[PDB]
Amino acid sequence: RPFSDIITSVRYWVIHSITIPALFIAGWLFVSTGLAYDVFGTPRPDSYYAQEQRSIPLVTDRFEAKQQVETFLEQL
Amino acid sequence: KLPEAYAIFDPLVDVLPVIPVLFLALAFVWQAAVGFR
Amino acid sequence: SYPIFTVRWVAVHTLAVPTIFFLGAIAAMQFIQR
């Protein structure tokens, strides 16, 4: 139960030498695949703007803001 | 740059000024080895 | 003697598992061409 007494044991380091790299790789693959952009709706570095027009897609309606975001995302 | 014969030691020269800071860190490592007695 | 899975274990791991996941994600962000 003391933290030093468990981090200085071998079983802890076997278990966590397994688990910690797997979580690190899972986060790495969450970003490097591009799934984070799709999940959180964060624009990719080429999808901030449309083809030619430079207008920030601010939402201006409260109840149809979801449709405004979908309309902007349909333009690229 | 460096003299042209001293060309393969550029990474070593690149990490040379960092070294004194490590000495400070080394003291704590030594103090951790003796349990800060 | 000492049990394994206690409240302290839950608190530590709810703080620590997403920490390592986010650190891996942030490193993969470090290697993104800007």
């Binding site: 200085t8 | 490592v29 951790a32 | 942030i26 290697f31």
Partner: peptide, 29 residues
């Protein structure tokens, strides 16, 4: 048997330093 505590502390510190240095390296790139 038991890993010395100072070894764990040193390697955790070095991992922390490498992570922070990688963040600053990405901040410069």
């Amino acid at each position: 048997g038991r890993i010395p505590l100072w070894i764990v502390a040193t390697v955790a510190g070095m991992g922390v330093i490498v992570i922070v240095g990688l963040f600053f390296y990405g901040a410069y790139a």
